[PDB]
Every structure is written in C-alpha cells, then in structure tokens.
Design an enzyme around this catalytic site. Structure first.
Site, PDB file in Angstrom:
ATOM      1  N   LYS A  30     -33.094 -35.645  42.762  1.00 54.64           N
ATOM      2  CA  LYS A  30     -33.540 -36.881  43.406  1.00 54.64           C
ATOM      3  C   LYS A  30     -34.623 -36.568  44.410  1.00 54.64           C
ATOM      4  O   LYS A  30     -34.551 -35.567  45.137  1.00 54.64           O
ATOM      5  CB  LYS A  30     -32.382 -37.591  44.119  1.00 54.64           C
ATOM      6  CG  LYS A  30     -32.717 -38.953  44.740  1.00 54.64           C
ATOM      7  CD  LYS A  30     -31.464 -39.622  45.304  1.00 54.64           C
ATOM      8  CE  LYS A  30     -31.636 -41.123  45.564  1.00 54.64           C
ATOM      9  NZ  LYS A  30     -30.346 -41.816  45.898  1.00 54.64           N
ATOM     10  N   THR A  68     -28.105 -32.017  42.121  1.00 52.80           N
ATOM     11  CA  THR A  68     -26.657 -32.069  41.963  1.00 52.80           C
ATOM     12  C   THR A  68     -26.269 -31.765  40.516  1.00 52.80           C
ATOM     13  O   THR A  68     -27.130 -31.529  39.681  1.00 52.80           O
ATOM     14  CB  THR A  68     -26.096 -33.440  42.375  1.00 52.80           C
ATOM     15  OG1 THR A  68     -26.355 -34.406  41.341  1.00 52.80           O
ATOM     16  CG2 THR A  68     -26.703 -33.899  43.712  1.00 52.80           C
ATOM     17  N   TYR A  70     -25.210 -32.488  36.770  1.00 47.07           N
ATOM     18  CA  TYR A  70     -25.622 -33.494  35.827  1.00 47.07           C
ATOM     19  C   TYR A  70     -24.347 -34.126  35.300  1.00 47.07           C
ATOM     20  O   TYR A  70     -23.563 -33.468  34.612  1.00 47.07           O
ATOM     21  CB  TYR A  70     -26.443 -32.866  34.700  1.00 47.07           C
ATOM     22  CG  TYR A  70     -26.896 -33.863  33.661  1.00 47.07           C
ATOM     23  CD1 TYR A  70     -27.733 -34.909  34.006  1.00 47.07           C
ATOM     24  CD2 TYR A  70     -26.493 -33.743  32.332  1.00 47.07           C
ATOM     25  CE1 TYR A  70     -28.150 -35.826  33.060  1.00 47.07           C
ATOM     26  CE2 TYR A  70     -26.906 -34.644  31.369  1.00 47.07           C
ATOM     27  CZ  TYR A  70     -27.737 -35.692  31.733  1.00 47.07           C
ATOM     28  OH  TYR A  70     -28.146 -36.622  30.792  1.00 47.07           O
ATOM     29  N   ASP A 112     -20.592 -48.678  49.847  1.00 42.88           N
ATOM     30  CA  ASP A 112     -20.936 -49.411  48.606  1.00 42.88           C
ATOM     31  C   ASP A 112     -20.213 -48.952  47.332  1.00 42.88           C
ATOM     32  O   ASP A 112     -20.813 -48.558  46.321  1.00 42.88           O
ATOM     33  CB  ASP A 112     -22.442 -49.390  48.385  1.00 42.88           C
ATOM     34  CG  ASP A 112     -22.883 -50.394  47.349  1.00 42.88           C
ATOM     35  OD1 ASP A 112     -22.132 -51.349  47.048  1.00 42.88           O
ATOM     36  OD2 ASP A 112     -23.977 -50.207  46.801  1.00 42.88           O
TER      37      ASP A 112
HETATM   38  C1  LIG Z   1     -26.848 -45.722  35.786  1.00 46.97           C
HETATM   39  C2  LIG Z   1     -28.056 -45.019  35.147  1.00 46.97           C
HETATM   40  C3  LIG Z   1     -27.526 -43.634  34.823  1.00 46.97           C
HETATM   41  O1  LIG Z   1     -26.683 -43.516  33.926  1.00 46.97           O
HETATM   42  N1  LIG Z   1     -28.040 -42.614  35.588  1.00 46.97           N
HETATM   43  C4  LIG Z   1     -27.638 -41.313  35.440  1.00 46.97           C
HETATM   44  C5  LIG Z   1     -27.493 -40.721  34.182  1.00 46.97           C
HETATM   45  C6  LIG Z   1     -27.092 -39.397  34.097  1.00 46.97           C
HETATM   46  C7  LIG Z   1     -26.839 -38.638  35.227  1.00 46.97           C
HETATM   47  C8  LIG Z   1     -26.976 -39.176  36.513  1.00 46.97           C
HETATM   48  C9  LIG Z   1     -26.749 -38.403  37.608  1.00 46.97           C
HETATM   49  N2  LIG Z   1     -26.327 -37.121  37.611  1.00 46.97           N
HETATM   50  N3  LIG Z   1     -26.254 -36.684  38.743  1.00 46.97           N
HETATM   51  C10 LIG Z   1     -26.643 -37.650  39.578  1.00 46.97           C
HETATM   52  N4  LIG Z   1     -26.670 -37.519  40.912  1.00 46.97           N
HETATM   53  C11 LIG Z   1     -27.098 -38.607  41.815  1.00 46.97           C
HETATM   54  C12 LIG Z   1     -27.178 -38.075  43.102  1.00 46.97           C
HETATM   55  C13 LIG Z   1     -26.263 -38.443  44.090  1.00 46.97           C
HETATM   56  F1  LIG Z   1     -25.342 -39.247  43.838  1.00 46.97           F
HETATM   57  C14 LIG Z   1     -26.352 -37.909  45.370  1.00 46.97           C
HETATM   58  C15 LIG Z   1     -27.348 -37.008  45.702  1.00 46.97           C
HETATM   59  C16 LIG Z   1     -28.267 -36.633  44.737  1.00 46.97           C
HETATM   60  C17 LIG Z   1     -28.182 -37.163  43.452  1.00 46.97           C
HETATM   61 CL1  LIG Z   1     -29.334 -36.644  42.316  1.00 46.97          CL
HETATM   62  N5  LIG Z   1     -26.966 -38.746  38.881  1.00 46.97           N
HETATM   63  C18 LIG Z   1     -27.395 -40.521  36.591  1.00 46.97           C
END
Ligand SMILES: *CCC(=O)Nc1cccc(-c2n[nH]c(NCc3c(F)cccc3Cl)n2)c1
Ligand SMILES: *CCC(=O)Nc1cccc(-c2n[nH]c(NCc3c(F)cccc3Cl)n2)c1
Lengths: 230, 234
Positions: A30, A68, A70, A112
């Site tokens: 992110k 983070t 996956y 949230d």
């Molecule tokens: C809802 C859309 C969706 O499905 N998005 C998605 C798909 C696959 C994987 C992810 C995913 N994997 N890890 C993360 N981390 C999110 C995150 C945090 F919650 C906190 C800090 C940093 C990160 Cl990258 N999302 C999402």
C-alpha cells in the site's frame, strides 16, 4: 529492523497492489498519499494469526510503503457474494472475534468493522487489519454513536455476523441512512437470516442492546461462538 | 523455501541452543542425534500457523545432521519460570497462561492433533510472558499427566491440561508429590484427584476438575475450556 529495500519489491497489480518481496514471497503493498501520522509502531508490536501480518515498510525515501501478507481471497464482502456451509460461516465469525478479542485485551478499537474491511487468505481464513486502530459508518453504528469505547465495535461485529450469514446483503437495505438511524432508535433490529440458527442469531443480537453496558465483551462473544461450534 | 543456510546461523549456547540467524535475529536451534527419515514431522510444523505455537523459522536439511530453527522464547520452559517468578505473578496472569495454552490446544484439537506430553516442563514463555506449545512431535505414559484409560484421543490431552492448570496455579509443584508413580496410579483409579491449590478460585478449579472425569467422553473439549476460561476472565 523492519526497513525493506524497495529494490527488493516487484509490483504486480492494483486491487493497494499485489507484489513480490525478494522475488520469492507473495505480498500486498500500500502506498500513502493523509500525511507523519506513529500508526505502524502499533502494527509492529501487535501479534496475532487473525491480524493481517506486517512484513515491513519503506520509509528511507518517498513515498511510503506498507507491505503485508497477501490475502489471496480478498475482501470478505465479495467472497460471501462470489458454496458455503453453516459451519464455515461460523468459523469466519470465530476468526474476526479472536482478532477483536486480542485487540479488546490491549484497549484498541477498530472503528470501521464491516465485511468490506475484512480480508480472506487462500485457506479461507478471515483476518482484520491492525492499521488505522483507535485507542460514522451508519449501518454499523450503535444508537449512542448516531447521536469511542469497546461496545461500539461490538455493535459493528453483530452486524458483521448478520453480513456473513446473509451471504453479504446491504444491511437494512430497505431504508436510507436517515431512516435506518431513526428506526434503530425505535428498537428495529436486523431480522434472523435464513442461514443462522436461533443459537447464532442470539449471539449477533446480543450485540445490539440499546445500552452499551449490557452488550457482551469479545471475550464473551468468542466464548458464545465456541459453544455453538459443537 | 524453509531451507536455512547454516552459514547464516551462529551457535552461542545450550539450554537445544540459543543463536543468531543472519546476524540480526534471536533464535533457538534444535539438533537431532531418532532418525533422519522421521522430516515428515516438519511438514506439519510448516502447515500449522497460530501465535500460541512456537513459530518455526526453518531447517538445515540439505546437509547433515538436521537443525530445526524456531523463535527464541526468552523466559524458557514454563516449569522453571513459575518457580523463578513464584512471588511476581497475580491470579489474572496465571489464567492468561491457561488461556494461552488452551488456545494453542484448541487449534490443535480443531485439526485432530494430539500433544502427547502436555505439561509445564514442555511449554515455553517469551519476553512478553506469553505461553506457547511446540507443534513438533505431535501425534494424530507420563504418569501424573495421564488419564485412567492411559494408565491401563482428544480427551487424553484434556486430562493433561487439567494437571497443567494445577501446575500453573501450584507455582510449579510436583503433582501428587506425596505419592510415587505406582501409588499415583492406584489413587487415580480410586477416583482421588488433585486438590484445589491456594491460588485457584472455585470457578478456576471447577474448570480444572472438569478435565478429570473417569469417563473420557464426559470431559470437555478445548473449545469449552477456552469458553469456560474466557467466561471466567471477566
Ligand atoms: C476488496 C477488493 C480486494 O479483494 N482487495 C484485495 C485482494 C487481495 C488481497 C488484498 C490484500 N492483501 N493484503 C492486503 N492488505 C491491506 C493492508 C492493510 F489492511 C493494512 C496495511 C497495509 C495493507 Cl496493504 N490487502 C486485497
Ligand atoms: C527448559 C530449559 C530452558 O529454559 N530452555 C529454553 C530456554 C530458552 C528458550 C528455549 C527455547 N526457545 N525456543 C525453543 N524451541 C524449542 C523447539 C521446539 F519446541 C520445536 C522445534 C525446535 C525447537 Cl528449538 N526453545 C528453551
């Protein structure tokens, strides 16, 4: 110690993005726009299997990254809507509740807590994020919020249970944000979804006492969820 | 993937050893003398995942002998940590130690794994005070930790976990210290049990005592113990 070298980060696709870390490892990454705003020292101390695992950060130059695990099944809201069995649904609930129990024990709040903000790994296991914790999303908010303590997450969690066993409906779909907040104060609550037994609904419902000091702790919700699971 | 190059490991001192992985990290290092066929264990360590399990870091298989690298748990095994720290605990903390272990074990029960020697000597305690269990050497007769049906499945561990509760709350006392093993077996067959330690409340001991039904199928699962325990903690 946690400082990653962006040399080691190969970026793969928007979803926050899929990437690789050191060529081997599946990671989500992110990128901050928000400012300085100390969060991650929480992420770096917190430690639980049902929280999205921090792998590291890129601060030594600009902009900033958080990396983070996956969670390959993505967000829960979609995963519900995209085969299930009522025991699986009860595990999904168990998972979030464990995380929240941990967080509850450490005086943290989610703020949230909904199905769109929950996340699902390849093994079907559901996790919550420790980034953005406190220490008005209308349809997940208790009365006292619609006009910051433990028991508003409890409300939110009750609705999440409703969300899960619904296979992902818009809660109170019939009403606007305004009508919903009115009706909530009248004493209207979410109707037992098809897939929840009486034993289940009782858990979710116990979250929605108009008085916050009657609602259970996560401690007790988890206890209640264990109980049904046999 | 889990392969660790023993270039990157230091071997500082015995305790199983303490060392440094890649120069940065604290680790524990276990060296086998058992076989080099019975690796098949380690795939189980590799697929399980839970904070209250001593986390696996990696192995040294490509060459001989074998090493298992795990997280360093700075306070050691639980039995010694109870006794060292006997005057430092408070009853809420003792119950968290119970919760920790009960959690590990619930996870393991939810995956049809049995511990085998669940007891205060084989639990470990990190710098935070959190208690964990090894997932190495699971399955699918330590006398004092054994139920009637052993002395002549899931509920075996249950019995043992009761003695574990008794252990924690006893600050490391030998269970049934009056008696020898032969004696201990008779008295368990007689229905005698372990008495309620000073530090254990009624609710607490009720929970520990529920693990010791002569009838295994009348013993609770770790699901209900954790529920029970969480229920008490308020
Ligand atoms: C809802 C859309 C969706 O499905 N998005 C998605 C798909 C696959 C994987 C992810 C995913 N994997 N890890 C993360 N981390 C999110 C995150 C945090 F919650 C906190 C800090 C940093 C990160 Cl990258 N999302 C999402
Ligand atoms: C009991 C004496 C003692 O205090 N021992 C001790 C002290 C500090 C740290 C440890 C320790 N830390 N990690 C481990 N891991 C043990 C282990 C497993 F449980 C499974 C596989 C491999 C290992 Cl090394 N011991 C012990």
């Amino acid at each position: 110690s946690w400082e990653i070298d962006p040399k080691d980060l190969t970026f793969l696709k928007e979803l926050v993005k899929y990437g690789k870390w050191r060529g081997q490892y599946d990671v989500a990454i992110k990128m901050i726009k928000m400012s300085d705003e100390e969060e991650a020292k929480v992420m770096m101390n917190l430690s639980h299997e049902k929280l999205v695992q921090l792998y590291g950060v890129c601060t030594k130059q600009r902009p900033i990254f958080i990396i983070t695990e996956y969670m390959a099944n993505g967000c829960l809201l979609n995963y519900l809507r995209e085969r299930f069995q009522t025991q699986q649904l009860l595990e999904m609930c168990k998972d979030v509740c464990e995380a929240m129990e941990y967080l509850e024990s450490k005086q943290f709040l989610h703020r949230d807590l909904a199905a769109r903000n929950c996340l699902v790994n390849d093994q079907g296991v559901v996790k919550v994020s420790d980034f953005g914790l406190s220490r008005f999303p209308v349809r997940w908010s208790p009365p006292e919020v619609l006009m910051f303590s433990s028991k508003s997450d409890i409300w939110a969690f009750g609705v999440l249970m409703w969300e899960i066993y619904s296979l992902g409906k818009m809660p109170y779909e019939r009403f606007t944000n305004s009508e919903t907040a009115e009706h909530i104060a009248q004493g209207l609550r979410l109707y037992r979804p098809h897939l929840a037994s009486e034993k289940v609904y009782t858990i979710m419902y116990s979250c929605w006492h108009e008085k916050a000091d009657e609602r259970p702790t996560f401690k007790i919700l988890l206890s209640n969820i264990l109980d049904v699971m046999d």
